[PDB]
Structures are given as structure tokens and as C-alpha cells.
């Protein structure tokens, strides 16, 4: 009991089990560790980043290897619409003969792959279980590279200084140009060279790539400027993916819409997209100043941006030193951007499927959308939590203030009451009225008179759909009109492909919407606004309030301020994150429920079921949950079991973890300390067990630890039960 | 890049003069012991105790490989596969088309014999106070001194003799595995070739 | 030794032996003194 929390002497002197619990939960809070400097902080974060990237690459290599070894990738190539992809084999000694038989796929029990990796790897030009093995080998090599780099940059002569870590202009130039633009350029190179011929039956491997021309003219049009030659003769409308029948020779085209066979974006479209992105990012990577006297100094840009009339105070003068010296501001910005980006991925990979035959893989579509939306919610909550942490421990009012006047960030704490009050008003407005309309529909339909329902046509959103070319709402607006300047401009470039895809009932591109979509979008807006209210209130009130005008002196995470002055439960900024996690889970649940029910009705064909029953709550409860839960719960019955048996077990497991979270959330400490004391007395006063005594005094979990454990149980149960439900329902309903 | 130093002057490598001379074996041992204490103090890793124990096991295993070859050649080593109905589905290896290929019964028997020997080893490990030679080093005990390139030529039942024979047996196992991997035959096939034919006869 | 014997060789190994040794090491480490 003197060397586990090596980074904290205060914890290492704790005689109780709290030392072990807090040793885990404070291991990555490097700024709070004993004998801590900024240089060591940045160096340790750098090495941890290297180890993390190595972990990511090892995970991808493992996926590749297990698909290559125990999957059916090669068989799935020849029949992608009937063969179900296999993730990996199963060896579990607890299986009975029935479980072995039900999970048996080809040669061994195996799990279907819901990650969509088969379609992704097939699209980028993989046709052999030896191509996957090469990828796994290369990724393990890259992981070894990253681990070696992480070790190296902790060595004495190779540890970077604070100036290098805080060199904003150099890092931005390189990140933007090199990372984004050059990675897009290399991806365009791969796309063209390998993927484009492989979709046309020509194999371009690591042997015949220096001799197989990606285009017949071969780099002559690029240098000659005849760039149109790369767009001539695109893939026809009768092209069979992976075969030369009906193929073309173009490598960079505008076609819009989807491939007629795979129902996915054209490979030549994506290569052109990545080439354009590469050029744009390489250009944008020269903005900031470096050792060659030209570029921008972002301190000057920030300082010079003060509106002349004066409404943002003194502008952004103190923001450069504020962001540079704080790792929580940057982390919050990065997390917010990543959350928006993965929300974008979720919202675009279902409307615009980019991988061949992924549109017809309904379980993987649902799994991908749900996974990315949950990750998005997590990232957004993390961004706001780290903003609150920045307020608590990194914000300096003196830097953000010049002669009494406050800069753009410090002014957010002046009208903080206005911001919180208006967030509260919007949340109450949306909640009151969305619930009112939903309950009105509930009562009116229940009384047998559905005609009295309040159904608001989402005209604003249908207006946007018509603007993009959907001739379904009779708006004749911009691209629904053939005479508008928006249509004549692109009538020869990408409208014929785009219009043919948007005006198709079998796509998810701009799904038709009705009053149910209106109501559920308002519910989503309410969830977003309430989660934002909780997080913004916690961030702004992090440094203090009327109930605790010295909250900054207690840190980001503390249990409370006591029992007097009223009370003081959940007063810290960490508690705001803790409360907003429930609202994030609820909002993501609403979003994923809406998406999954809409797509289940679209795939099954009974879109009239959603359009009618989605306007009232009992419609949701009866036709989504109760209706589609039947295949899942019958994964094993007193008569037998199916391959969905694991999903029913996970369903029950998620319910159990959810209710254990309920334990940890409803029942607080103090009730568990006295019980533990009784147990301690019982152990101390019993023979044959007095010979064994604890080294750490058993104590109840701390208030903050209990909140974290209850939140973890709640979230894990939530995620597990919904994943089981969505996957099993899709599989058991749509064959 | 230019207006600052990537590596601070206070964080620079210093040449370790404490390893002057100190042939690669001594240098490697010292580096392992300094870098990984509490596993070096136990005698684990590149240590004379570990080398002696592994040599003993390698010699005994050369004996075991000879015995296994003899048993395979002489009609011993039971035939068939394990009964999945008797030993559960964990003994099933694959199902090609309607038949369950199980773990061979010979493999199960050999695993049981190896389990006997490994159990004896585990007992001796958790019997430190009653065995002549312990598995690990006591706190304070110091690792016997490395024998060097050539251990002393002391015939009989001597520490040097056992040391040399253990090194020879471990090298023989390394060579056997290398030959089997490079050429592509079974381990017992390589042993049979290396005995002329007197084993699998 | 075929490739299909690798699951039966590795899954017990990892999923039982690695917990045992990891628990031994972690318990020893967190119960150390100074």
C-alpha cells in the first residue's frame, strides 16, 4: 500500500480501497500528477498518442486478419447479395450441440459481420484473402513503427520542447497540407490505380502497377492540360462491378447519383472528389507563416478582429495565448469537430452509400448509423466537458481582459445568465409543445377519432428536398424546375445522375417525410437543446455561481459543498456532464429510433405504417418496439434457439446492467458505508476467517465514483440493449 | 525548426562508461537486470538459473521426443479421435460435410503425459522449502555465475557437465525446429532422418 | 498440427492462463510496500 498510484502520493497514503479505485480513474489526468511540469505533460501526451495510433492500427489489422482467415470474403465476392459476410469464427466451450448447429457457418460457428468491412474492402479493390493478409501484415508493421516512435520520443535527446509543441503555424501548415491534402492525393492515387481497374476486372496488385496504365493516355492529358480526357468514356449503365462487362476508361468524372448495379457512389466520382479535396487542402496548407517570411501569424489575425462599432468587446486579442497554453480548450474544439464530423458520416453514409452492395445490407446499415450517432453524442459531450474543465483550471480572466474591457471569450461569462435562461426557454418551449402534440395525438387516436390529430406537414424541410431536385411535393422550386438557372447550369454535369437518384423510391437519398418526421425532428431539437443547456450551464457555472461563488477553488470534479445553506448536491461541473450524459443517451436514442423505424418501414415496404403510427407515442411503442422485438426475444425459447440467441442474451444483459446503474444512481453513500461496517465486523469476529485480513480497509465508493459507476452501468446497458434490439430486429424481420 | 530548440539541453544522452569492456553477454545481462528488476532478482530471464532449468527440460524433452517416436513406430499411441459425445464440443476440431473431425486420441494421451510432467514441475515450484534446487531465486540469493562461452570441462555429475549438456540439448532443439521449418518435414521425420532410420523402424 | 487446432490451443490459454498470471502480477504490484 505504497506504490500503486505512483503519480499521486495523496492517494498512495489512503488506507482504504478508495486508493485503488481512484488510482484507475486519475491515471490519465496527467496535469494533476505529483512532480508535474508542462514539458513532461506534452511529452507523455505525445507518447500516449503514438501508443493510441498503434492500438488503432492493430485493431484494424486484427479485423483484416480475421476476415482473411475465418471469413468468407472470397465467396462473398462472387455473390454479394446472397452470401452473408462472416466476421470471425467462434470457439466457446459452453456451447451445446444446438448452439453449435445454429451458429455453424460453412466449417465452424461464426459471427456475421455487421461492420460493413466486406463492402468497404471490396469497393477499394480487394478480391482475395491474400490481399487482406497483406493489409494485416502492413498494419502490424505500421503499429510497430508507431510504438517505436512513441518510445523514441521519450528518449533524452529526442523529447520535444514546449516551443515545438506550441508551434501552431508549423503544425497547422503540415497537418492541413501534408496530412489532409497529401493523404487525399495518395488515396486518389490508390483509388484510380487499383480500385478503378479492379472494379472493371483488371487486377492491379503490387506487381503489375508500374506497368498497368490507370488511363490509356497515361499522364499525357494531365501535363498537356487536356484534363477532359480523364472524364471521357465513363462506366456505362450496364456495368457489372468487378467485371469488364460494360465498363469504361475514365478515371475522374462527374456522374452524381449511384451506380445502377451496386447502388453506391461511382468510384470515378470519389477519386475526383479526393483529388479536388487534396488540391484544396494542399493549397490551404500554405496559409500560416514559417521560416520563409511569408504566411500568417495567427496572433495578429486574432488580435486584429475587433468589430469597429464594438459589440464583441475587444475582439479575439487574448484568444491566442488562451488556446495555446490550454490543452483542454484544444481538446474540446477537436472533440466538437469530431462529433460533428461523425454525425456527418452517419447522416451521409445512409443517404449516399459509398460502398458497393452496402445499401442492401440492412443490418450493417442500421449498425453503422447507430454506432456513428452514439460516437457523435459521446464526442459532443466530451467537447463540452473539456470546455468546462478549461473554464475550471485553464481559463485566466487577466489574459482575456484588456483595461477592464473583456474579449470575446470572457464576455460569454457576462451574459451567461442570458444564455442559460434562453436555453432553458427553448428547451421548455420545445418539450411542452412536442409532448403536447404527441399526447394530443395519443388521446385523440385512442378515442377512435384519428381525424382530429394535429399533423403538421414539414413544408420547410420538403422545400429543401424540392430545392435539390425532388419532384414529389409539387414545389417546382430550383432543381425541381428545368428552367431555373440552378438546373440549366448543371444540366450537363451531374443533374442526370443526381435527379435519377433523388427521385427514386428505393433509395434512402432524401427519404420522403411527413408529419411524423416533423414531430420527431422537433423531439430531436428538444433533446439537442436540453443537452446543450446542461453542458453550457455546467461550463459557464464551472467557475462559480450564487450557491458557490468559489467553485473554481474546488476543481472540476468534487462531490458537493455540504449540507447547509440549503443543500448542495451535484453542484460541480463534473455533475453537469454526468446529468447531460443521460440527455445525450436519450437524444441519440430518439434519433436512432427514428432512423431505424423509418428504414424498417422503407425496407419492409409498409411505409404507410410509419406515416400513420409515428404521430403518436403508442404508435411508436406498439409498432416499433413491441412489433419488432418479437424475433429478438424468440432467440431461444423452451423449444429451441436460433443464431439470434446471443442477441436475446445481450438484450437481457443490457437490461440488467441498466438496472444495476439504477442501483448506483438512486441509492447513495452512507447507506453503504454502515452496511460495509457491519460486514467488516462480521469478518473480524468469525473464526476460521480471522486468519485472513484485508490490507486496504473496505469502504463504500465515493459519491463521485458512485455517480460514475452508475452512469457507466446505465450507458453500457443502454448501448448493449439497443444494439441487440436493432441488429436482431433487422435480421429477424428482413430475412 | 529554427527559432527554438527541439530538444532541451538539459535532456541529453550520456555515454554509460560503466559498461566499458563487458562483452555483449555481460552487457546484455547488466542491461536486463538494471532495466527489469524484481524479475531479474527472481532469476527470470537471461539468467544462469533459468538457463540451467531450461537445459534440464530440453534434455528431458529430447528423451520424450525419442519416446514419442518409438511409441508411434511400435504400434502404441492410440488410434482415432476423441468422442465428442463423451468430452463435449470442445474436442471438435472441424465439421467438413456432416462429420465432426475431433482431436486425435493420440494427441490427448500425449497431452495427458505432458500434464503429468508439468504437474510434477508445478508441485516442485510450490515446494521450494523441500526441494534441492529451487525454481526461482530467493531474495538475497545471487545468480550463479555465467559459465561463459565454454563451461569448465569437468566430467561426471558436475554443475559444469549438466550446464554443457543442457546448452547442447537446447541448441539441438533449436536446430531440429530450424531444419523442420526450412525443409518442411515433420519433427519426428527430421529425428528419424537424423538417426538414420533406427527410430521409425 | 493443423490450423483448426489453434482455437483450442489458444482460447483456453489466453482466456484462463492470462487472467491468472495477470491477477497474480497486479495483486502483487498493488499490494507492495515501500
Amino acid at each position: 500500500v505504497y506504490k500503486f498510484p505512483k503519480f499521486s502520493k495523496a492517494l498512495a497514503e489512503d488506507p482504504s480501497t478508495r486508493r485503488i479505485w481512484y488510482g484507475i480513474a486519475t491515471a490519465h489526468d496527467f496535469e494533476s500528477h505529483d512532480a508535474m511540469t508542462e514539458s513532461k505533460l506534452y511529452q507523455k501526451i505525445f507518447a500516449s498518442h503514438f501508443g493510441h495510433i498503434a492500438i488503432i492500427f492493430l485493431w484494424t489489422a486484427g479485423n483484416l486478419f480475421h476476415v482473411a482467415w475465418q471469413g468468407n470474403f472470397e465467396a462473398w465476392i462472387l455473390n454479394p447479395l446472397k452470401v452473408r459476410p462472416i466476421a470471425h469464427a467462434i470457439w466457446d466451450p459452453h456451447f451445446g450441440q444446438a448452439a453449435y448447429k445454429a451458429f455453424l457457418k460453412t466449417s465452424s460457428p461464426a459471427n456475421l459481420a455487421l461492420s460493413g468491412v466486406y463492402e468497404w474492402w471490396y469497393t477499394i479493390g480487394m478480391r482475395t484473402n491474400n490481399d487482406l493478409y497483406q493489409g494485416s501484415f502492413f498494419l502490424i508493421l505500421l503499429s510497430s513503427l508507431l510504438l517505436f516512435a512513441g518510445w523514441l520520443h521519450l528518449q533524452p535527446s529526442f523529447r520535444p520542447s514546449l516551443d515545438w509543441f506550441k508551434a501552431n503555424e508549423y503544425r497547422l501548415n503540415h497537418h492541413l497540407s501534408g496530412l489532409f491534402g497529401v493523404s487525399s492525393l495518395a488515396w486518389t492515387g490508390h483509388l484510380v490505380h487499383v480500385a478503378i481497374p479492379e472494379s472493371r476486372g483488371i487486377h492491379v496488385g503490387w506487381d503489375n502497377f508500374l506497368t498497368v496504365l490507370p488511363h490509356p493516355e497515361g499522364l499525357t492529358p494531365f501535363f498537356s492540360g487536356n484534363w477532359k480526357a480523364y472524364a471521357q468514356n465513363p462506366d456505362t449503365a450496364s456495368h457489372i462491378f468487378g467485371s469488364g462487362e460494360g465498363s469504361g476508361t475514365a478515371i475522374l468524372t462527374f456522374l452524381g447519383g449511384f451506380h445502377p448495379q451496386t447502388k453506391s457512389l461511382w468510384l470515378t466520382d470519389m477519386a475526383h472528389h479526393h483529388l479536388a479535396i487534396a488540391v484544396l487542402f494542399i493549397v490551404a496548407g500554405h496559409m500560416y507563416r514559417t521560416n520563409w517570411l511569408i504566411g500568417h501569424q495567427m496572433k495578429l489575425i486574432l488580435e486584429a478582429h475587433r468589430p469597429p462599432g464594438g459589440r464583441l468587446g475587444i475582439g479575439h486579442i487574448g484568444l491566442y495565448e488562451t488556446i495555446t497554453n490550454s490543452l483542454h480548450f484544444q481538446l474540446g474544439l477537436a472533440l466538437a469537430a469530431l462529433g460533428v464530423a461523425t454525425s456527418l458520416t452517419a447522416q451521409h453514409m445512409y443517404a449516399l452509400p459509398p460502398y458497393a452492395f452496402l445499401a442492401s445490407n440492412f443490418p450493417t446499415q442500421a449498425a453503422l448509423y447507430t454506432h456513428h450517432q452514439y460516437i457523435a453524442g459521446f464526442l459532443m459531450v466530451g467537447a463540452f466537458a473539456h470546455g468546462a474543465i478549461f473554464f475550471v483550471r485553464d481559463y485566466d480572466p487577466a489574459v482575456n481582459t484588456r483595461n477592464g474591457e473583456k474579449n470575446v471569450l470572457a464576455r460569454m461569462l457576462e451574459h451567461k445568465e442570458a444564455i442559460i435562461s434562453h436555453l432553458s426557454w427553448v428547451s421548455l418551449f420545445l418539450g411542452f409543445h412536442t409532448l403536447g402534440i404527441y399526447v394530443h395525438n395519443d388521446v385523440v387516436v385512442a378515442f377512435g377519432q384519428p381525424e382530429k390529430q394535429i399533423l403538421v406537414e414539414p413544408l420547410f424541410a420538403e422545400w429543401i428536398q424540392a430545392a435539390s431536385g425532388k419532384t414529389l411535393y409539387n414545389f417546382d422550386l430550383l432543381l425541381a424546375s428545368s428552367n431555373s438557372p440552378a438546373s440549366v447550369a448543371s444540366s450537363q454535369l451531374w443533374l442526370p445522375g443526381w435527379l435519377s437518384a433523388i427521385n427514386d423510391g428505393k433509395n434512402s437519398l432524401f427519404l420522403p417525410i411527413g408529419p411524423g418526421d416533423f414531430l420527431v425532428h422537433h423531439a430531436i431539437a428538444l433533446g439537442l437543446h436540453t443537452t446543450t443547456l446542461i453542458l453550457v450551464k455546467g461550463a459557464l457555472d464551472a467557475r462559480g455561481s450564487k450557491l458557490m461563488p468559489d467553485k473554481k477553488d474546488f476543481g472540476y470534479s468534487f462531490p458537493c459543498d455540504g449540507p447547509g445553506r440549503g443543500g448542495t448536491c451535484d453542484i460541480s461541473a463534473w455533475d453537469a456532464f454526468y446529468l447531460a450524459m443521460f440527455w445525450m443517451l436519450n437524444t441519440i436514442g430518439w434519433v436512432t429510433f427514428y432512423w431505424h423505424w423509418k428504414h424498417l418501414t422503407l425496407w419492409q415496404g409498409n411505409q404507410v405504417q410509419f406515416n400513420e403510427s409515428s404521430n403518436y407515442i403508442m404508435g411508436w411503442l406498439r409498432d416499433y418496439l413491441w412489433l419488432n422485438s418479437s424475433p429478438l426475444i424468440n432467440g431461444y425459447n423452451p423449444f429451441g434457439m436460433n443464431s439470434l440467441s446471443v442477441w436475446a442474451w445481450m438484450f437481457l444483459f443490457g437490461h440488467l446492467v441498466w438496472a444495476t446503474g439504477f442501483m448506483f444512481l438512486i441509492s447513495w453513500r452512507g447507506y453503504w458505508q454502515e452496511l460495509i461496517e457491519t460486514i467488516v465486523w462480521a469478518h473480524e469476529r468469525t473464526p476460521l476467517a480471522n486468519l485472513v485480513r484485508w490490507k486496504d480497509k473496505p469502504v463504500a465508493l465515493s459519491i463521485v465514483q458512485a455517480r460514475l459507476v452508475g452512469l457507466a452501468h446505465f450507458t453500457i446497458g443502454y448501448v448493449l440493449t439497443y444494439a441487440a434490439f436493432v441488429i436482431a430486429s433487422t435480421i429477424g424481420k428482413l430475412g | 525548426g529554427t527559432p527554438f530548440d527541439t530538444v532541451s539541453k538539459d535532456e541529453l544522452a550520456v555515454e554509460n562508461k560503466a559498461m566499458a569492456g563487458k562483452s555483449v553477454f555481460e552487457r546484455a545481462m547488466a542491461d536486463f537486470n538494471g532495466r527489469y528488476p524484481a524479475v531479474a532478482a527472481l532469476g527470470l530471464g537471461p539468467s544462469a538459473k533459468a538457463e540451467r532449468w531450461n537445459g534440464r527440460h530440453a534434455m528431458f524433452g529430447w528423451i520424450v521426443l525419442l519416446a514419442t517416436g518409438y511409441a508411434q513406430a511400435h504400434g502404441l499411441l492410440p488410434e482415432g479421435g476423441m468422442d465428442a459425445k463423451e468430452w463435449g464440443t470442445w474436442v471438435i476440431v472441424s465439421t467438413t460435410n456432416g462429420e465432426q473431425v475431433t482431436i486425435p486420441a493420440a494427441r490427448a494421451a500425449i497431452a495427458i503425459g505432458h500434464l503429468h510432467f508439468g504437474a510434477v514441475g508445478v508441485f516442485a515450484a510450490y515446494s521450494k522449502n523441500s526441494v534441492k534446487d529451487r525454481l526461482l531465486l530467493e531474495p538475497g540469493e545471487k545468480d550463479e555465475a555465467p559459465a561463459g562461452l565454454f563451461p569448465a570441462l569437468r566430467p561426471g555429475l558436475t554443475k559444469e557437465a549438466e550446464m554443457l549438456n543442457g546448452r547442447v540439448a537446447m541448441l539441438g532443439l533449436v536446430a531440429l525446429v530450424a531444419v523442420s521449418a526450412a525443409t518442411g518435414q515433420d519433427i519426428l521425420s527430421v529425428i528419424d532422418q537424423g538417426l538414420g532410420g533406427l527410430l521409425l523402424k | 498440427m493443423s490450423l483448426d487446432l489453434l482455437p483450442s490451443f489458444f482460447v483456453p490459454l489466453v482466456g484462463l492462463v492470462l487472467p491468472l498470471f495477470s491477477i497474480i502480477g497486479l495483486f502483487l504490484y498493488i499490494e507492495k510496500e515501500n
Binding site: 507518447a47 484473402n129 510497430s144 510504438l147 | - | 490450423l3
Partner: peptide, 30 residues
Amino acid sequence: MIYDSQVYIALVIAVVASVLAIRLGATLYN
């Protein structure tokens, strides 16, 4: 179907990546 040699050398390379991982783990200190 991948061969025994392919899986074996991938396992050996994985071992090398493991020794590199503990070296990074031990260098990030106890």
C-alpha cells in the same frame, strides 16, 4: 486459405510488436 507459414510468421511478427509494446510500456514508467 492461408498456409501455416503465413500464420506462423504473422504470429512471430506479432511477438516482435509485443516486445516493442512492453518496452514502450516500461518506458512510460511503472
